[model samples]
Target: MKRAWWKESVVYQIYPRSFQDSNGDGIGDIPGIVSRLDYLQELGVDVVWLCPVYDSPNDDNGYDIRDYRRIMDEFGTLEDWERLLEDLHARGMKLIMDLVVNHSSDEHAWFSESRKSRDGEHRDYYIWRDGKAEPNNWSSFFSGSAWKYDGETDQYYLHLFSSKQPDLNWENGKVRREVYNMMAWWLDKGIDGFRMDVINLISKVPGLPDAYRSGADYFMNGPRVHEYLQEMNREVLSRYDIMTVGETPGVTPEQAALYVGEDRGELNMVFQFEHMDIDSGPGGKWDVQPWRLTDFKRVMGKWQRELQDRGWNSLYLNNHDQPRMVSRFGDDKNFRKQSAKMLGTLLHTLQGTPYIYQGEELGMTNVRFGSIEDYRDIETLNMYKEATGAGRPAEAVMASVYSKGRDNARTPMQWDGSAHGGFTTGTPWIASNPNYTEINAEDARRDPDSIFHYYRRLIALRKQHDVIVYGRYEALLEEDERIYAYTRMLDGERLLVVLNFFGEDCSLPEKIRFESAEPLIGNYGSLKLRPYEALVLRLQ
Candidate 1:
């Protein structure tokens, strides 16, 4: 709808710790990323979103930041980062750094200072209150109450996640100004923009009032979020001609339009969590049970249709947080390549910029851990421990872990069938998926009809036709039980994309008539879709 730099651009996300290892340290760093520029170039991606490599204790895998200005020793130096920027720009590519500012590591200088004497200047830089008891009965997204007691100051600090990661006090005007200045500095340093980390949680209702804390009312998408967003936009983002998208954990389309739409001008787009949270329990915990396909189709269709002209949508099925798209949406273990191709077709042909995570083209799946000891993510391991303590059956917890564990997305990227899934020569910091031999990227890349090729063809089609990029989206048979069908149209040009929900041959209505059209790309050979099949057709 609007002319944005990244509207039709293809974005590929790289988990820096697993993309490549150049020094043979068994860990991926900036130099490792620099070494793979050609590999990324060959894929024809326009932008790369690198996860955090900043200085940190890594208590939450780099999301907890101790320093904003320095790169972690594990990731390399600022010189390496500058070199990467130059090489990428020379090759006509842009880099989007992950902006994890919703919370800072407890070890951060600000947090360290904030935890000193209660009357200190920095004490109000974070949420702190005197309490011999828990604060407001709020539960952390990880587990337990959200507030963690710090005996040094004899007060409780608010942490939506781990106790080690304290939430920043956006209410503090000085802190907000400093944050804006730092972000502007990054823009000056030539970063395309930022992929904001949990930006919607930055502002909270004043006084930190204690509530029931069960629904979205207490946890996410807090009050004054839009006001704070508008402030940030006018103060920091508006000054630069940069692109940004908010990683909003709990925002609706109506709400999203206010931040990213043509009228808002706050961000280029916003990531909505409605579809991703379908598997979550009422208490904001993962509870695995089969969901009706209609629900997903309805939510996805509504967001795509409602935001079609109002704002830009950021299309994605899996990133660093969710499990692999094929594994979570289709039968990854049984239908592997076909299902992976289906997922690619379904997302890429949608009316938005498509983002592909590492190893997703190969249809990598969730790791099956024997015990919680095998996991690395603080969130997942904490959930396991809590479920056990609550007397939930081990088998039930394992079932949930297999289907909905965030750790599923944290496993090392499966590059090849070699040691550490070809991720490293030495031991991986996290356990490698056992099925890497069958789902590695190397094997998929070699095959012409593999899922990897399907993704390439999908990207090419989007680039080849304007209809696929800026077209209006409309969903047909929205109430259907086992089928998902949508059409994209720009002027008179049209493209139809459909998916079969289950593992079977199902018939769907041919809603819009066209003079002549053919299958542009699909997981299968014909328009006749098999179970989990995705088809894209160009009407000419």
Candidate 2:
């Protein structure tokens, strides 16, 4: 019902560590991102969501922030970051820095000051309680107790993730003020917006009650989260003309309205993991399970329909925390190109801001690393060590690792068929996927039919049609097995999108017919829904 620049924008997420290397230091840096500005501009990118480049110890990659104000050494200096800003803005592209405030690195000055003594000046800035054995039986995201003991203070501190990333006490007025001030500093420093990390987890239930279902129940979407968010909007966010998206876990469409609804004034949108958790078994991330097309359709369509009238939604297939989309959701081996285009058609035509993860536009697939030693993500390595140490078969653990490891998406960006994927001239910190020779950026750019070009067209189409932007979404043939179809309508104009989600060809529902079959875009002429084929037909 309302218009905003970000509402129609395409946000391209770049995991800087694996994006590009400019200094031969085997790490991707800000200047390297500046070098890739031309590539992004050609893809018609509207916004660039740069993952955290803040000063960090790299314990959990850049997620663990040691200093919020400075850029990390591996990512170059503050000067390099400014150059990236200039270069990217020169391309007419906006930049949104990652906002990681749910937790701070133990090495952060605040945490360092807080951990000194019980009555320390900054003691209340972090969550700490008197404990000996443990605070509670809550498990952490990284496979251990959520509380870590400190001998000096004779207390335990809360860390929902790695022990190094301590949860910030949102109840502390001082903590919230400092975080808001830091956010304002970045906004004034020239970033277009922020991609807030685990923002909903900032508020926790008082007393830190033990979880009934899991640790997530106590902190995620806590009672005071909306109060805090509204305060944030009134204090810092509303003053700036910027876009904001939260990395919100455990949110449904009904709850999502409270975050992004037009009157809510909390956020522009949020990244929901409802669809992502479909392929995981009861054992969670380390447990591989076959995802059904029916499940994917239900979850994705549910979000679309429920938010159609009020709240906004964010459309994404995969990101830094998950494996590549094509490998996990489509046929990557045989019809990789076609399947990638089909997925693009599905996401771009949907009613929301579409986020394109780096390397995803190149149809990047998952990597099957030979050993756990080759994995670089802390989550992945931790899972392998935990699963194998529990007497799980080595092969079974490796199989799950191959299917759903964060490192599968962290492989160095394949720039060309070079010894190091053109990501680095020297040794890469993490190994590049071995299939770089066949799937690299240089080759994709040269070929007009490549996934990169397909994404370009998709974004361009999005900008040209209001139907794709503000259109109402209606699910078509909801009971279908292999066919995914929908119609987007705006002001009485209609467009039909049909896709073959699997490797095998399937017939479209016979009842679905239109006056004209003018194709906006398709991998091939739509006679039958071919294997991994997508057809966005313009109907009048």
Candidate 3:
């Protein structure tokens, strides 16, 4: 296996808007992030992937960029961001900014110019076509026609997301050049690399073909994506020694190698959604049905086996996009702490660089707001409106909202038991989770047995054992229903990881054998396990 710093490193993601609030603004800012540096440093994380803080209209939060050079007023100024960089580096941690370039906000100067006149110099900067009817039959990811008709220019513009966010035409050489130059500018700013948002959708197939079902068929993992990435690597990324992980959806293991293969000169790694998407029903994610443990094993195991010898893997269960890991996959109600620790154990010991989403270390769960009126995420609000409008009961729609809504992951971080969970002195931009008094970072840090400390030990173990970082993974009893057992094998070291992922006393299988048991970190001590019990034993 090819060795790199990022391969052995553990990364923590921070959703800026909800992480912390400084100066009592009720919203997190760059300065607020700086205030929380000691908490992250204490957790022993190597890198922090901060979500987009760029200037935006907040249409899709910070994902829709209106200006690349300036910081949003809501997020503070360049000075505050630079302080965050300096403080983080001083704490021996690196920062990776979120890069969202698949589209630019319609209010961006480029888009404003591109929309003014049909024959203008910036006309081709965006995808625009003249059609009285429609350009193509494609649906936006946020739920609408991908093409939005503009009467001013009498043309239809393509937007895979919100109509306020217009897709840039990568076919335009000038656009690609601008992107490369901007990327280089960031690299020169003394920060680290980027976590590209929806990077696979940057390049689309020629002729703007209509989608057969969803628009992903025509736009996702598009034809020239690899070539474009290679170009990007050569132009800016190669010039600097940094880590790059692209958020790639709709990618297969075979196809993944083409993007992050060691020799591909494209990216260091790619975040694959294969394991995360297993819960989707026939009607897609909104169906919100129970996900089987067997399917999760099959999907997770496939990635481990297929990518073991090729491109590296980025392991994560939840992020700003999905619901909480414990709430979704583990028993969050009866065994939140045990299940959270078990989930962290599996991720850290796996053959990949594990990403800890914000509040995940303290085992934060998905929010269960009673009504859609309290939701702030655009996608969730749109889904609620659409489902309820289609004659689905509000209760049924809200049930799906409870399970798969983006707002579940967007609630304010529970820091302490004070007002707004100590996140702000005033009203929070969004409501804090109601259980903040019971589950806050301050209490978790106080208790050595809390999930926060469990995660800290998980990170510490990765550093102590080379077998944890570079070991090859082997599945044990691949067909087991509730027992998720795997072994990490290095040259002469073997570590057995057994996780009972249910609310029951699972029997110890005969297949698991060890010469001498060395108890490592786990929830319940022995193979004589309890609900959501986990054990990692070393045979010495």
Clashes of each: 1, 0, 0
Clashing pairs in 3: none
Name the regions of candidate 2 deviating beyond 4 angstroms: 505-513, 525-527
Query: Model 1: clashing residue pairs?
Result: 504-531
For candidate 1, write residues 1-540 as lDDT tens digits.
Answer: 566668988888888887777666766888878887876776678898898989989888789889988898888899998988899999999989888877889889988888888878788888887663776867787778878887888889889877878988888887788788878878889987788988888877776777615324644777766777778889888887667878987788888888778887577888888888766656454666567888888788888888887788888888888877787887876787767887788778888888888877778887788877887777777777887888988888777777777678767778788887777778777788887787777776787877777888888888888888898888776777777888888888888777776787335465677667688887777235477788777765
Local distance difference test values of all predictions, in order: 0.79, 0.87, 0.85
TM-score of 2: 0.98
Q: Name the top lDDT candidate.
A: 2
Summarize candidate 3's per-residue lDDT along 1-540 as a digit string, tens digits: 878889998999999998888978877888998988899999999999999999999999998899988898998999999998888888888999888889999889998999899878788989998663787878788776888988889899988888888998888889999998888888898777789988899988788886514778668998889888999999999999899899999899888888878889998888898877777777777766566777888878888888888778899999999999888888778899988989999899898889999989888888888678888878888777777667888888888788888878778899899887889888888888987898899999898899999899989989999999899888886778888888888998988888888887345556665678886787854446667877878864
The Cα RMSD in angstroms, rounded to one decimal, for candidate 3 relative to the true structure is 1.5
CA error at residue 28 for candidate 3, angstroms: 0.6
lDDT of 3 at 422: 87
Q: Quick one: how many clashes does candidate 3 have?
A: 0
